């Protein structure tokens, strides 16, 4: 059960299109101890490819997502962080250090660097997930380290790098990405996979051979 994600405290950085859908999937399978970190408001333009609805527009994305997540299962125990990463409070920093699995769903290079500069104080499972801009592909990176390996993650993304992304595109990658997360936590290590979707929704894969 030390390789069961359901027993892990999981932090999701980024409560946008991909992160919100991944968080919902993880909650439904029983990952009840989730932290959601996002400083930005949910915008009406987001709803074409988001987990939430108009009732959350204008609210903080993390707080609104957590309210939703905690209504999915009786034992849901999601907590919101409405600050940017990294927090300023040492209290907030210690709160983030309690999580076992750190999932970056921002697509932001600045967040990759912040993860590497943050002092996590112990070994974490790090996962970074993001899509190409038309959602034709999914970058999937994982590492089990005391510090996030930004240099390796960047080189993997760079080596891998037809209409606007729709809800079905993002839900497809949230599902693939949820399965990736579960596979990583079950057998942690240095892992990189790049997925591509075909027009009929089939999915091909190219893993990196370390």
């Amino acid at each position: 059960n030390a390789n069961d994600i359901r027993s892990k405290k999981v932090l999701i950085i980024g409560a946008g299109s991909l992160g919100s859908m991944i968080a919902e999937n993880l909650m439904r399978i029983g990952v009840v101890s989730q932290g959601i970190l996002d400083a930005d408001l949910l915008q009406t333009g987001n709803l074409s490819r988001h987990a939430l609805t108009m009732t959350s527009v204008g609210h903080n994305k993390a707080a609104a997502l957590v309210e939703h997540l905690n209504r999915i299962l009786p034992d849901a125990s999601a907590r919101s962080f409405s600050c940017a990463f990294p927090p300023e409070s040492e209290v907030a920093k210690n709160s983030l250090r309690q999580y076992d699995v750190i999932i970056d769903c921002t697509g932001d290079d600045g967040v990759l660097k912040s993860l590497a500069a943050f002092d996590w104080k112990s070994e974490k499972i790090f996962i970074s997930l993001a899509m190409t801009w038309r959602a034709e592909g999914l970058f999937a990176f994982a590492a089990s380290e005391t510090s996030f390996p930004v240099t390796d993650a960047s080189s993997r993304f760079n080596a891998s790098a037809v209409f606007p992304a729709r809800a079905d595109d993002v839900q497809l990658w949230a599902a693939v990405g949820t399965k990736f997360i579960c596979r990583v936590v079950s057998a942690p290590g240095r892992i990189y996979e790049y997925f591509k979707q075909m027009p009929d929704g089939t999915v091909e894969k190219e893993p990196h051979e370390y």
Partner: peptide, 4 residues
């Protein structure tokens, strides 16, 4: 960067 990338899209998420």
């Amino acid at each position: 960067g990338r899209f998420a």
